[PDB]
Amino acid sequence: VDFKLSPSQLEARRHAQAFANTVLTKASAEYSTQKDQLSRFQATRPFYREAVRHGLIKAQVPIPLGGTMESLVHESIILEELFAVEPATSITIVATALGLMPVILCDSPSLQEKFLKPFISGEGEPLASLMHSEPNGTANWLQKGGPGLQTTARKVGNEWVISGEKLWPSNSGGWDYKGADLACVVCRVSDDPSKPQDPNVDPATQIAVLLVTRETIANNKKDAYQILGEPELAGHITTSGPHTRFTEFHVPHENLLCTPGLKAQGLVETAFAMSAALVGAMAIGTARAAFEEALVFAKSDTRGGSKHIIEHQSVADKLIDCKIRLETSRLLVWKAVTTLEDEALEWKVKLEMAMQTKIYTTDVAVECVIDAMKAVGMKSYAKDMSFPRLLNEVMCYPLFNGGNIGLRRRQMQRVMALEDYEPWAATYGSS
Amino acid sequence: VDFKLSPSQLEARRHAQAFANTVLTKASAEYSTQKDQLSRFQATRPFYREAVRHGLIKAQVPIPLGGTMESLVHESIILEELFAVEPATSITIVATALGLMPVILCDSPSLQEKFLKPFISGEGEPLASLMHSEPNGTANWLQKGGPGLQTTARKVGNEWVISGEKLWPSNSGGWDYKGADLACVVCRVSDDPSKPQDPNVDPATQIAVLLVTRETIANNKKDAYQILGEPELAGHITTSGPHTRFTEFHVPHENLLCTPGLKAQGLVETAFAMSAALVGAMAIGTARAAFEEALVFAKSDTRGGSKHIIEHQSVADKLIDCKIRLETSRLLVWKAVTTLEDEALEWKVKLEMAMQTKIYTTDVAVECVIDAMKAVGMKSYAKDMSFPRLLNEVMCYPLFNGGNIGLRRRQMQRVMALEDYEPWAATYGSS
Amino acid sequence: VDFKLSPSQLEARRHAQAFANTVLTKASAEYSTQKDQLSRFQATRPFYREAVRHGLIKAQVPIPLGGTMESLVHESIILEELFAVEPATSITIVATALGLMPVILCDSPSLQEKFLKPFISGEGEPLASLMHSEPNGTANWLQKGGPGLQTTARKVGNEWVISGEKLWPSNSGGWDYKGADLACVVCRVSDDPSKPQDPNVDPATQIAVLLVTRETIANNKKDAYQILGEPELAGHITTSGPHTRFTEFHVPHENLLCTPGLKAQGLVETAFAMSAALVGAMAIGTARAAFEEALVFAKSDTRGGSKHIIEHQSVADKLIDCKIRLETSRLLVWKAVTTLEDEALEWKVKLEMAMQTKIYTTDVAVECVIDAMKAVGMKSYAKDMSFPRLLNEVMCYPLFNGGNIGLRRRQMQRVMALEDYEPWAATYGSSK
Amino acid sequence: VDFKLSPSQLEARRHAQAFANTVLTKASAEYSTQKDQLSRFQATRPFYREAVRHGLIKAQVPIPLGGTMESLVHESIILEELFAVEPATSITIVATALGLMPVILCDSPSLQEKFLKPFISGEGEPLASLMHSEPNGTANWLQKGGPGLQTTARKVGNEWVISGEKLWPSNSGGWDYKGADLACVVCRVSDDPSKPQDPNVDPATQIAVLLVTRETIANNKKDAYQILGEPELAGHITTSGPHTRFTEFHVPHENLLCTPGLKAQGLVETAFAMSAALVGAMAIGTARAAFEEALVFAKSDTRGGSKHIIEHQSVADKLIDCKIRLETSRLLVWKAVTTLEDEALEWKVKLEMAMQTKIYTTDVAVECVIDAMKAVGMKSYAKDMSFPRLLNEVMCYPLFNGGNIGLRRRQMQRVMALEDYEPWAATYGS
Numbered sequence A, B: 001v002d003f004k005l006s007p008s009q010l011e012a013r014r015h016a017q018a019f020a021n022t023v024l025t026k027a028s029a030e031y032s033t034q035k036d037q038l039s040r041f042q043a044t045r046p047f048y049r050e051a052v053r054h055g056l057i058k059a060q061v062p063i064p065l066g067g068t069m070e071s072l073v074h075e076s077i078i079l080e081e082l083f084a085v086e087p088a089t090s091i092t093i094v095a096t097a098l099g100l101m102p103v104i105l106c107d108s109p110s111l112q113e114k115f116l117k118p119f120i121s122g123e124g125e126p127l128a129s130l131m132h133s134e135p136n137g138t139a140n141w142l143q144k145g146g147p148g149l150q151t152t153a154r155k156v157g158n159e160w161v162i163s164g165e166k167l168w169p170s171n172s173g174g175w176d177y178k179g180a181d182l183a184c185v186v187c188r189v190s191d192d193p194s195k196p197q198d199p200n201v202d203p204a205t206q207i208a209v210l211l212v213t214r215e216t217i218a219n220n221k222k223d224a225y226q227i228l229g230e231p232e233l234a235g236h237i238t239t240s241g242p243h244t245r246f247t248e249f250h251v252p253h254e255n256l257l258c259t260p261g262l263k264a265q266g267l268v269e270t271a272f273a274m275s276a277a278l279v280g281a282m283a284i285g286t287a288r289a290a291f292e293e294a295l296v297f298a299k300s301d302t303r304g305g306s307k308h309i310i311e312h313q314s315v316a317d318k319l320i321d322c323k324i325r326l327e328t329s330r331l332l333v334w335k336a337v338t339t340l341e342d343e344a345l346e347w348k349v350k351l352e353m354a355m356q357t358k359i360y361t362t363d364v365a366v367e368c369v370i371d372a373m374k375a376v377g378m379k380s381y382a383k384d385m386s387f388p389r390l391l392n393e394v395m396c397y398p399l400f401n402g403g404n405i406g407l408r409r410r411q412m413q414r415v416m417a418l419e420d421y422e423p424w425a426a427t428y429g430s431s
Numbered sequence C: 001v002d003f004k005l006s007p008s009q010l011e012a013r014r015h016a017q018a019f020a021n022t023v024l025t026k027a028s029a030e031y032s033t034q035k036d037q038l039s040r041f042q043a044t045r046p047f048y049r050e051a052v053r054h055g056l057i058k059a060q061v062p063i064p065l066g067g068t069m070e071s072l073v074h075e076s077i078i079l080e081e082l083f084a085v086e087p088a089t090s091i092t093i094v095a096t097a098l099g100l101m102p103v104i105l106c107d108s109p110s111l112q113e114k115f116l117k118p119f120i121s122g123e124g125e126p127l128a129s130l131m132h133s134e135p136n137g138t139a140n141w142l143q144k145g146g147p148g149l150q151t152t153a154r155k156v157g158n159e160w161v162i163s164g165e166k167l168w169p170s171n172s173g174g175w176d177y178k179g180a181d182l183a184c185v186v187c188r189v190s191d192d193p194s195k196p197q198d199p200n201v202d203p204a205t206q207i208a209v210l211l212v213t214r215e216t217i218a219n220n221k222k223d224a225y226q227i228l229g230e231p232e233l234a235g236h237i238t239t240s241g242p243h244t245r246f247t248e249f250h251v252p253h254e255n256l257l258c259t260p261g262l263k264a265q266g267l268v269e270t271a272f273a274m275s276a277a278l279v280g281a282m283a284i285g286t287a288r289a290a291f292e293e294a295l296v297f298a299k300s301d302t303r304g305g306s307k308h309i310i311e312h313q314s315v316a317d318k319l320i321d322c323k324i325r326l327e328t329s330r331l332l333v334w335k336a337v338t339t340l341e342d343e344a345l346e347w348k349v350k351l352e353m354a355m356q357t358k359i360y361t362t363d364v365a366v367e368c369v370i371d372a373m374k375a376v377g378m379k380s381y382a383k384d385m386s387f388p389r390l391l392n393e394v395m396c397y398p399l400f401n402g403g404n405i406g407l408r409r410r411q412m413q414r415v416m417a418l419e420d421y422e423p424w425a426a427t428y429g430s431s432k
Numbered sequence D: 001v002d003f004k005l006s007p008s009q010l011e012a013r014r015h016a017q018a019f020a021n022t023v024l025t026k027a028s029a030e031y032s033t034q035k036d037q038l039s040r041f042q043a044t045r046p047f048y049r050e051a052v053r054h055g056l057i058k059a060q061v062p063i064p065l066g067g068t069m070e071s072l073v074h075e076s077i078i079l080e081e082l083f084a085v086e087p088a089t090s091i092t093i094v095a096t097a098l099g100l101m102p103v104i105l106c107d108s109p110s111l112q113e114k115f116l117k118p119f120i121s122g123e124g125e126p127l128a129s130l131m132h133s134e135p136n137g138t139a140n141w142l143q144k145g146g147p148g149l150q151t152t153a154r155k156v157g158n159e160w161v162i163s164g165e166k167l168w169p170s171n172s173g174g175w176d177y178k179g180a181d182l183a184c185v186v187c188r189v190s191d192d193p194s195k196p197q198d199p200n201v202d203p204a205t206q207i208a209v210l211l212v213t214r215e216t217i218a219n220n221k222k223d224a225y226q227i228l229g230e231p232e233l234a235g236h237i238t239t240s241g242p243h244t245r246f247t248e249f250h251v252p253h254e255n256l257l258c259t260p261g262l263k264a265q266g267l268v269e270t271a272f273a274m275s276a277a278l279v280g281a282m283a284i285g286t287a288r289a290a291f292e293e294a295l296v297f298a299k300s301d302t303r304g305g306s307k308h309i310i311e312h313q314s315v316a317d318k319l320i321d322c323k324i325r326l327e328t329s330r331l332l333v334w335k336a337v338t339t340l341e342d343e344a345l346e347w348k349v350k351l352e353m354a355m356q357t358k359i360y361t362t363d364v365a366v367e368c369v370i371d372a373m374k375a376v377g378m379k380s381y382a383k384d385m386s387f388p389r390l391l392n393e394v395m396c397y398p399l400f401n402g403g404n405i406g407l408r409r410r411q412m413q414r415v416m417a418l419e420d421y422e423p424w425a426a427t428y429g430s
Ligand SMILES: Cc1cc2nc3c(=O)[nH]c(=O)nc-3n(C[C@H](O)[C@H](O)[C@H](O)COP(=O)(O)OP(=O)(O)OC[C@H]3O[C@@H](n4cnc5c(N)ncnc54)[C@H](O)[C@@H]3O)c2cc1C
Pocket: A302, A303, A304, A305, A309, A312, A313, A314, A315, A374, A375, A376, A377, A378, A379, A381, B095, B098, B129, B130, B131, B132, B133, B134, B136, B137, B138, B139, B140, B167, B168, B169, B170, B233, B236, B239, B241, B396, B399, B400, B401, B402, B403, B404, B405, B406, B407, B410
């Protein structure tokens, strides 16, 4: 076993660090003045432009598919460096990666070649979005006997017709509310949308993913695709994840990602299991920023006494606790992405590892920031330090990309409950 | 041992509820338009006027002194209800109450009579402020061999001169920066302000409190009292606790609160101990709002499944923990304030009890809000729910009114180390 | 709202401390030499005898029933003091109180006179036991469509016939495996125990509670009542809570506590709700022993340093955390028992408050002992300090008297899910 | 970066599992029958003899020194599997390993050849002990201004004379109270043993380590080495770790491990930093055993309901928390022992990683056993299940090998305060 980093992993970090300090630091001046989420998203566009120019969007796509992604560990290193400085724009890149994911993961070379083309080109500001989440919630989307997804699709002649709404999909409306360059819209197949899901059919068998571009939207009536709102978020205030409504929205059959059913469900699951592991690097960056600020304060400030506050056992204990959390978190992330990439392992082993990573890293990032604030004391509470930003940003992570309580713990529980569950298969091999 | 609320206690609750619901619910429409801390604070003035009209500022002064304060339990119940709805204005009442505490507590009926006058009157918008906090910190203000406080007073004729800076004390500059109606100003006595605090005298013997009114500020040079800045706070965005420089600020010897030394220190200590216990009522209110919003949602939203989410064991567990935290917190506060009102108990017993309460209630209120958010899920992260505001507001409590790590734990630690410490004396009497 | 203790409350404390110090401290010399759980329990009998002679068994019964119990706060005070010193015997008093509770709680003056008599007499060592728990578990006993209690009862002639097994109930086989003086056996009614519980009958309608005395077991054939085993416990090593089998065991109709069904269930629930609140006083006692052993040590020992270890912030933070846990716990127990005594409040309100109390106090006591051990350091791991004993003892509380995970949180969850749930009813009263 | 185990790491696992199953499972029948720490310890001798015969004492010594230790990850793997079955004897192997460390780590080929020889032989049941801990405690043993260690040493001609008491060093008195085969006794230098440590000299500059054998004990007066007492322990009931008193105990100058001072302290510091990391494997072993037992139970028992209790979210949440604690702990331990083997990293980087690991893994292993018990419920409280044993064993770890509160957090805080502290040097290089 090995923990050493290669020259190009070391370079990937140097490059991501450089980008963060030279480019992303300048972003606050532009978005801090805007009146709302959308404007603050729009003021972010030139920084996403620079990220594309630096190859960061191209690096969200595997090498065999024309991108530059060297590995999932390189990816982890990049995300942590970025989120250590400024989640603005950084969150657009990662939201774009998710959106590309069902396409990256399908076994259809011609579909990939067409749809990933803008994203590997090294230019523009193309945006991808995985449109899964809904106003009514999705923790229970695969629950047999339940409502199911409220965005449905039916086949009409040689087209699919989407009806229903999405909420929260990052990047989905695009820069101008005329759409992301690529959106993957997860639908429940229903022939009469006003009929409840059949309580006797397994919900996973009814799942379709329909690709939807700016062109698809142009080719529809204006009212067929409405943005009804843009949530005002506690943190990550520069992202866009609108409330969209599809009313008799027409999509070409050739935009069906694969055959509706368990394969389509499996592509969503694998995309979201991969983000589950990666999202830990986001959490580590944010909490690393809280820890490093507090550490530098504690080593340079006596707080009106006769020694630096790091010499007080209780200040030390908090920073120790922060340190341990960050350390165990990065290890777990790296273990998990490395598990995901191992072709010898059963999916359920990869899935379980990814769930654990998401649950642990996200919950523990929150503790890390709060402890860092407690250690710095009253000064962490005013906006001339980073903490107020960090505090709101960190609380996203346990909630988002499938909430720990409703989704990730339930997915893990389900694997653990199977007869053939091998707890240590990712470590000690399969028995 | 009895827990039953009196008719006067239930009236105070009803009364505080009616004020919060009819008056403080309107506050937000006003201050959300303003674009900085002071603008927001001033927009709060009409609601503080209303609070004086409802007699809330007068309810802060005991009966034997012309105010209507019935008991500390009444006060606990009042603060809980205000904070469960709106910390705007509510925070001003409490900051005013802290400001008046040292006057309320001193041996001197003529000073009590002259300075409390505008607060017991029922008219105007009088503000008070107890000015202890400094830019360099205060956790070590009483450390022997330390630099002590940096706000110092010297005796020059029939006057005291103040040199130094203050940060954070809420209300200190009044509505307009011409000063609070009654500021107490905790000072280190130094004949030569440019000489370091002598490392050989207990710092608690150099303490002096000087009463500074809007009049004193008018009877001084325009450059003798300056507001250097106003912190943009993470939460409690409508409060004012600015950066204040005293340069050659002249104060009448008659405005001296008591004898410099252990008595002056004891007065600051007794004031901050009372606020330590009462701060838990603010923290309970903020957390109670988080819990009840989460509870109402759990009991009425299925989150796209077949049953209300409270029916999920993991969701219920979160709410159970919130509930427990809130219940133990309230008991501890009521026990704390009762202990402070008992005249048979030594001071160290009331101190230790008050310290516990500040530490517990404020740490646990943060947990309660985060858990409530986790139980609600993604929805809790947008501003059509209260949680974003509550999260920011709740992170104030472990940090403010003497942070737990630096101040309250060491105050408690000092007491427990004393040779004659009786841990259970507030419960089973002294032996 | 008022926290002062009365002279009679201060007397209950003094009396219990004196009892614990002078009597209960001699018990270890006796039970430590014994080779198994039963022997350790038997070696405890002289100390239970002394408990009776000090009237501690009579203070488990209300005054209106000929007992000397003054209140539930008095009770809580007494239990903290006893558990702060030694849970041997102390556990037997409280097991007995639980076993007496269904009888104490019924509305049947003649049964009370009859069955409670030996416990109010100040004589002998009479044992009671609430026999509910079972080999297969009880967290799901009331689950519609589940198998339900495996101890069943059927009426034959003017008698009931008990079939099946209990496990865990303290005192249940009495001093000698010939039975507690009074056991309340919780059964599910069933005419043919070979048949599964009916999945369309609400389980709570099928509950029965049968009084089983030493007289009742003597009147049965030898193999109708058998002790099959005695669990060897991590802590509370001197308590007895055996594995009992009933095979065709005959009980007289006159010993049925009340009509089978919801009223039987309500009796069990009420008793376990009361014990839920009082179990917190037992947790408080154990943890307080830990906190105080550590506090003393921390202010007497420098651990080769120049200042007493209480003077290190990390050590203080532990003790501060222990103290906060003990103070908040005690407040909650007094709040809960006080709420339970409040006639103006609905059952749901009392139940919820008791569940919280059990959950909080028992979880947090564990933490309190572990932190105290961490504060003292390596020395806390050797049997010449109390900690090894306290750590095994404290882990019982979250698991026993209805575990927090399977039972108590489920009970509280269910109350919280009711449309008419008022969270602060016990503080601010009901909104109609 | 790589997580894959080599063929020989998987073989070391198989070998440790098989030995734990075929041999260690029979230990309890012997020691349970016994009445006190020592007799329980002595009842363990045949199982150590089998550990030696299986090559396990030899695998505690590096290959350059004639042992068979393949690497510190192999070691981590070996200990995890041992402690997941039975800590008895298992503990004796690691106490021995620690007691050999300062000889393994010194740079003195003649001391190494001489003192490591019994332990690489494959024969007997030789024991080693690192005798550092004392009745008055050791968290403050390096405190300038303090009393310092209370076992002192002074030079008399061409020998050293030891004066003081040790408490807790596992194995120290050997099997029969006539001493470990090798003990490394750590003393403070004091010409006058009744004189208080000079408050003006750095205590680290006065540390000495003296090698004591069964022969050094034999060559002394009967009453110069007294075993005063044997603590009865909450768990790990089969170890010996006596209260020992040296009164005028003569050691040949040649048995002095190195030059007194910073270097002797450094040998002790490195030995305990290595153990600080490996001690995490033990804690994983105990906690894994708890977790596996609770998992098997939850997947096959309905607790009188209609479904396996693992289908209840509250139960699954406990097992998810245990699983996470174990997974993070193992990753951390492997990161730490690897960090320690990296010649390119400075010591303070290695120290800090090791302290993190001891603190995290041992704290978290406790919560893991307790959460496993709570998921299982009442039945976990009785001795027909493993939990009562596992509960007492697991509380050893946050407290032993330098307790977290007094020793390991202070060693870590001290590193974090240095001007040159690089938090991420072990991950992102210097
Ligand atoms: C809304 C609001 C209202 C406020 N109202 C008032 C008011 O009315 N009047 C007033 O005077 N102040 C007020 N303040 C400030 C408040 O009282 C703070 O608690 C005060 O500034 C002291 O801060 P601190 O406890 O973080 O200590 P600091 O001195 O700032 O220390 C900072 C941190 O350093 C560490 N530290 C320092 N010394 C030690 C030590 N000896 N041991 C262990 N750790 C140590 C601790 O981790 C501590 O948290 C207000 C602030 C806010 C935001």
